[PDB]
Amino acid sequence: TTCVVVRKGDEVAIGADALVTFGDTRLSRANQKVIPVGDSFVGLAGTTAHFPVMRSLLTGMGEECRLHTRDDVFRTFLKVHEKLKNEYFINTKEDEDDPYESSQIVCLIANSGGIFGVYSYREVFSFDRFWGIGSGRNYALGAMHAVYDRTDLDAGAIARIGVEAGIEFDKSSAAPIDVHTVRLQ
Amino acid sequence: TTCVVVRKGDEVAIGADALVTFGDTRLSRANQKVIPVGDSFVGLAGTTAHFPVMRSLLTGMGEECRLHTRDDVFRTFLKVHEKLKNEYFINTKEDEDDPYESSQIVCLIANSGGIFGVYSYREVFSFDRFWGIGSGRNYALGAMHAVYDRTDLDAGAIARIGVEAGIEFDKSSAAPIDVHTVRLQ
Amino acid sequence: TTCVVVRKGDEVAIGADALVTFGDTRLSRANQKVIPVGDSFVGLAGTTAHFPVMRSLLTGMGEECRLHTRDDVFRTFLKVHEKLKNEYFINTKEDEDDPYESSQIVCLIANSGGIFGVYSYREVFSFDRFWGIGSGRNYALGAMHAVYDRTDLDAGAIARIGVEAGIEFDKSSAAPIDVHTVRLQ
Amino acid sequence: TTCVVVRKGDEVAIGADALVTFGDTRLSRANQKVIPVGDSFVGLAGTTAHFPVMRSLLTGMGEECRLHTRDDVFRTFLKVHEKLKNEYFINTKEDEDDPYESSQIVCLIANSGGIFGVYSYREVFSFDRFWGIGSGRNYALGAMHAVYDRTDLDAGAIARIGVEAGIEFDKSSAAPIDVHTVRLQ
Amino acid sequence: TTCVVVRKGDEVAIGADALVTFGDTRLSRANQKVIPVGDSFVGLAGTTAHFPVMRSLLTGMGEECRLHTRDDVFRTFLKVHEKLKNEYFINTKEDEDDPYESSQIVCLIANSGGIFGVYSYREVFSFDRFWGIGSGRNYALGAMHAVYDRTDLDAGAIARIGVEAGIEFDKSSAAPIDVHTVRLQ
Amino acid sequence: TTCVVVRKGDEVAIGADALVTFGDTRLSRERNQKVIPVGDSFVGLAGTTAHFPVMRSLLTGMGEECRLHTRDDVFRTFLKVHEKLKNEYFINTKEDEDDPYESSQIVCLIANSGGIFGVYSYREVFSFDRFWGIGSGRNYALGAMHAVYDRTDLDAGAIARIGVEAGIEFDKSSAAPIDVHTVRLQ
Amino acid sequence: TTCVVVRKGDEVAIGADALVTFGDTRLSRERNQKVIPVGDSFVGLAGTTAHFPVMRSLLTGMGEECRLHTRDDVFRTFLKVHEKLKNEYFINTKEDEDDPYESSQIVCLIANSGGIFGVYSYREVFSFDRFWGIGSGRNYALGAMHAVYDRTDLDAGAIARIGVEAGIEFDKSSAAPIDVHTVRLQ
Amino acid sequence: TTCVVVRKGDEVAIGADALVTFGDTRLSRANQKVIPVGDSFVGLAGTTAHFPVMRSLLTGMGEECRLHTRDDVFRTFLKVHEKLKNEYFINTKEDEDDPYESSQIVCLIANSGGIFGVYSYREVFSFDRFWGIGSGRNYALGAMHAVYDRTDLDAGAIARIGVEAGIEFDKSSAAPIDVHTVRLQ
Amino acid sequence: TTCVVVRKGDEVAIGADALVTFGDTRLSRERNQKVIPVGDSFVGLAGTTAHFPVMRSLLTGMGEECRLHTRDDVFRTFLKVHEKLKNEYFINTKEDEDDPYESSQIVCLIANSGGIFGVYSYREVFSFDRFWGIGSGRNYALGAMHAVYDRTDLDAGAIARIGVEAGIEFDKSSAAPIDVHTVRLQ
Amino acid sequence: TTCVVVRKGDEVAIGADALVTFGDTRLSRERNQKVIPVGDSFVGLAGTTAHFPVMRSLLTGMGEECRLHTRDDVFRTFLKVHEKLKNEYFINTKEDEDDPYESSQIVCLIANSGGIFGVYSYREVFSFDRFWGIGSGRNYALGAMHAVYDRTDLDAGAIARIGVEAGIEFDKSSAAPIDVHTVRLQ
Amino acid sequence: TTCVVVRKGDEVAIGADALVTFGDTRLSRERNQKVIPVGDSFVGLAGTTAHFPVMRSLLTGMGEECRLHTRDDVFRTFLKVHEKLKNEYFINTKEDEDDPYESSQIVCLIANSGGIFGVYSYREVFSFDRFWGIGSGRNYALGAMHAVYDRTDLDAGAIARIGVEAGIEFDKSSAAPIDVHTVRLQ
């Protein structure tokens, strides 16, 4: 996976690749990993096997899923954690003494309030210019960093360039590219 | 095991091999891994040792076992998870940070509503053309992909060809082949 | 251990060896692993160290220990699981994602209702001709398979031949042989 | 440790060595591992570090510590398990699927009712002639087996010979030898 | 990370580097690891991924976050442990038999009451001259020890020198340096 | 990688995908790198891209002493490849008899007018009647080729393409474009 | 694999299954690949299919210097097989005395007019009086042959078939058809 | 650490070294590991990181901390275990099947009632002449054993000699030596 | 480390960061230590700082016998480097064919008027058309150079600088200042 | 161990602690054991006390053939030390290029009128401009020396003492007394 | 095992326990097996009883070429012991410089009129001023001897006895009776 979020000027963008697999076996589809949730867009980290519950949970919430500030995203995903446990019987533990782990990344978020990342359903970050997640994200970060200050490139174009870089070098990332842009409030 | 599901035109099909073992020792029988549940057919993944409880649970449910839509299959297997714990004292945990694991696959499903797969009793997928599970599934996927667009082949015939491929190359798959077809609503 | 069950004609049989050990050290006795439970015979898998509680539990049950059908054996051993936990404070967990393990085998059963095997106190199987368990069972299965269709051999004789094979080749199986026969209802 | 129990004629005996250590460091004393409990004698298996609670528990019980039959010893040590958990906050788990382990041995017992062994606070055995436990027990078993049928040797003398053998060959067994004899009822 | 605390004369100081990472990937920022909590300064140990909850918890407490004595810091962080569990569903276990582990370090603290360190949310230390934590702390300790008795250097200057040493030699420490000083009561 | 060989009628074929990587990082490339013309044979290389240059240089440099049209010839030729690797390039290729089957011991598939062959551990040579495949996508390829081999409208080249297509469809370590070469049997 | 040898009366027999695989993937084949005629003896090969070609080529190429009709002859012959593997084919077959029993050290079973034999680690040779078997299905085979050996209506060939049948019945790594050869004792 | 207790004549003594570390890094101090608790002295085993809670707990108890007999010490430290769990949320588990482990040692104790050692907060020992704990204790035991019968040496002098030996040979033991003596009742 | 090579138009470039460490402890230094002038080529060294001195001493001492302007020349030259390491400096550099891709087998990148090259395990030599990079920050560098390569205002030197900048930005084991050298193609 | 070398102005210094152990058990000693006079140089030995006697005997016995006043001389000298260890004392000192940085490969620090040096794996020699340190207490020492190096009142000897003091203060495997030797640069 | 050596005044002593085992099983014995008279020296052997016979046979057979009265003599003698073990008895005794301290590398303690010595890995020889000990009970022994060494009424023999007594008291792998030999210094 290569998923990125970008912020520049009065616009934000979220970009993602399309590859979905059950382990090493590719699954052909009719984008599955980027979800519209109200007027936000959420890009899911991790294995395809865990997408259906997350899509069903976030899209079903509706009004109680508030994402336009860091505190709102934080309180919302605390509620996502509780719903996973009580309704779907899924565990999402966090221990403070654990080091950084990629499998604890939940999602990136883009809306008119800004661009955000969620770690372990509890730790929420806000980003000023860009960030990315998944197996192709290091390639994406280098690309977006190299081109961000170009005057002819908006947030959507920078996000596309980020995903292109991930697809170019990562075997676990593949075309087509899905990009959505949103104007800041 | 090689178990497949196929959808083409106004018909769906489910196909499975017959090999059942306790570990490395083969068990001779009078098909054990494909179960009629109401008007659906369910193909069980995993070891033969865990078949009896699953067969007893699914066939005993009756009316509360609804499988003709993705949401119905989802809610039904959430109930299967609870029954396993409360009635049969069997555990089926899911952690979100876990990667893809073959031992979390529950079953494939075929009925007049379509063809489905269930992962970890919670994550439900719908398939457009075909899918397969078990040790011989990679051979089966290649075979079904190669022949799906043949105008002379219906869903039942494609499923047979899928199971044939699994039997040909996988030591843990064996004849005879069991195939059932159902007309879409 | 080599323990077998056989069914042929109007008779069933259960056969077992006599070797009992605490680890690698042999224990001399005055058969310990085959138990009469009402009008059934139960052959215990696993270490000698866990025999006393199982013998005490099964023989103490009496009327609530019903074993003449697959469903009865199933419900009975669900109750055995609960008694082990609540009365004797012993754990018998099952996880669905676990593969086949020999240490989960509980027993073989022979009575006028047929011949049965119990796995993990929850999964119950019925056998048509024969089966065996323990370290010498592969030798036993080969022997019984080779001689089953002999017109001069009844169920008791086939079971003896099964245990003989286990004793011949397995260091963890030893004479004398204990065989009991029961007429089918 | 080398601890043995013997039964012959109208007498039983229990024998033990004297070595006590905290790990590899020897502890000099004013026998610590053989305990008088009412009119029985109990020989403790395992590390010296766990002796004080066991001595305090068994000797404090008094009348509710009944040991003269297999069933009595069984029910008594079920109560010992509960007291360890509820009063002393010590765990003694048993899983049925576990293999034989020396660290699950609790004690040998000798009284006018016979000679007994307790495994995992739940599984109780009765012995006809002799048995032994601890690091020197294999040497002891060979010695007692070789001399048991000697007409000039009683149960006490056979037990001494058993402990002598353990002391001779096992570095974790040491003199002096402690032997107690009891007449059968 | 290199974070230090210093006490000398009528002044204390806290010093920290600026490097923040998600694993091996650096995160560019607009100091994130040093937090003003009332009139104290708290420097956070461990991964950047766990900063947001800790910052949100400590700054939200307000009056119930008392830090000017060893006992106050102790009782306050016991409450931090409970809030993490009950409000944020985060675990912070301590076992007494565990050895020293760097991942159990919580923070260093500097205020008008003195300089403190917190280990595992339960064990609180007070320091007379200085201490440091994180991957560059050994370099920092050597530097501060070498220069502490210099008559021209106050607590703030000694802390800067400590962080400089960490930045010089540790790849996981980077400029700019953040230092805050506070007068003792 | 998905590489296949096929034999049907008077024709044989060899097919391969194009993906080449240094570990997990893709390398953009130029004609197919893993299928090599060696005289009038075609050789498809198994394993990591990092070990391709020496193998390409060795096989193409041999010329006349690289004889591949029979099982025995392929066998003796690759014994010589083993010796050259050790003595000229200082590379080790050990075989122990007690070792089990390992995919990292696969060397190559071969197609020429003498037939279709596979080489394991530079010493064990097999001949195939209808088809075979190697690499991470080969199980998908085998299922596809098995399912379509008896089709009267499909020749050896077409069956090989279908094999590589299946590997590309399902294996993340296999990618288009597909390279196929056909040769008439002698 | 299930391979057995039997001796009874004036006849010996060798029996084997037909399943051959590259790892977990089955290879379709042609006559039985794992039983080899070597002069007037029959040799049944243990272990992975990947190591069959060199062993077949070595044993069948020896000819006159491959003498197998006594325990000492089989012993000296397979010492020479060990040396040829190392010097000609550059394959290692080490033995350490302190190693325990390992199934991957089994080389073959042998049947000829001199008797029935087994070879372990190319150095340790055994002679059998009634029967033995090797491979993943051998425990089932041993039980079957033991149960039926004393039947007056069954000769060595029939007992061997029954042994292989038992292996095929219960072992997933054993498959039909069954190959049996009988030889009269000298 | 080297901590010892000695008993001779009408006097007992407790001796300890001064080295305190956070892992491999030494901490300079203004003795931290020997605590006065009422009229007893308690020497703490294990890492410096766990000292503050133990010091705070034992010194805060006061009258309910009774230590002058084996049974009193036993009941007192059972209460210490409960307080650690309920007040400080610290775990101190004991399993009976565990072997001897140095990390389960709690403390040595010296008072007018005698000299004691506590293992796993539950198992209490009394010593006749001497004992020691920590990384330098083997050197200390050899020294004290060699000199105990010297007529010119009292309990305090023997304890000093014990700690001297630990300091001489153990890198994790360091001067100065702290010794306290108490007259037996 | 972040080291890159670039080729565009009539120019090539090599770029590297400056960070050098003994393990986790930084060493302050002097000109760039990891980029070496060897005749009229520039060589960027992969791996730990601890192994730089012998490699610098060996390559710069060779002189005329160190020929690097073609793939074959670089190949033969580094075969000789392998032999010198063993015979003169008593250092081992083994390669086994069955080993997978490993980053610790990377030797160097090379830039000269003949083109841009990479050397793996002293034996496997690659030529690059546009760019490549090695070391802990190379993935960031590859993404940056790929994103900007087709810019008409950027030459090979500028693209290399941008590559190293990206590595320094995100990798803790890469640090300023940046060292870049450009060479005109023959 | 804490051993340091310093260079400042016209003087160099070498400093070391005194702690020597067989494993965890301290050995009481006599002058400093880990700093050796070799001609007019001083050599500070890294690693376990158990390996000191052979190294002391070898270096002090060499005499004239032990030349240490330049980087190349130190390099050639310790290549000879490696050969003597193998041929005379039957001790192995292997280096593999693909190995990462390891503290157990550190041999010694050196101080003489030619400068201050460090030797890694008997083959890789470094020269230092201001200071360096080795052993378990070296990180504390580096921080101390870095913090005080630019003090106008401190010479090379005083900076080295301060370095060893820091190691002794914080490292349990470092202990007083401190041994320091100074030498004037040529 | 507890074995010690002591030096005080004009006398040295060597002391040892008597316990000998094959693994965990005790072997009953005869005079002390682990202390050997070699000419006019006494040698106490470390390690398992299983390796005593060759060492006893080698050292006692040497005679005149076994010189032990100085550190250099002991050193050269045990270099020769290493060579004899390899060439005559086919036993390996490797040393790698990068290895840490290991108790299984201890060879022996030595006492004679020249002083008291210890040998590590057949190559590293130490001389002791007051005392030392080896084996599983040595830490107890060191503490005892340290505590009593300065007693005016105790000679070297008495201090050694006290050392072995301490080992026997606390170590399960040490047992009575105690064997002590004293020798006057030259």
Residue numbers in the entry:
A (entry chain B), B (entry chain B), C (entry chain B), D (entry chain B), E (entry chain B), H (entry chain B): 1 to 30, 34 to 188
F (entry chain A), G (entry chain A), I (entry chain A), J (entry chain A), K (entry chain A): 1 to 29, 32 to 188
What's written in the study?
The second hitherto unknown bacterial proteasome family member was primarily found in Betaproteobacteria, hence its name BPH, short for Betaproteobacterial proteasome homologue. Unique structural features, however, like an elongated inner pore loop with a highly acidic sequence, distinguish BPH from its relatives.
Via the 6-fold symmetry, they form a dodecameric double ring with intersubunit interfaces reminiscent of the tetradecameric Td-BPH but resembling the architecture of dodecameric HslV. A closer inspection of the Cm-BPH crystal structure reveals two malonate molecules from the crystallization buffer to be bound per Cm-BPH protomer, specifically intercalated into the intersubunit clefts of the rings from the outside. The smaller radius allows for a tighter interaction between neighboring pore loops within the rings.
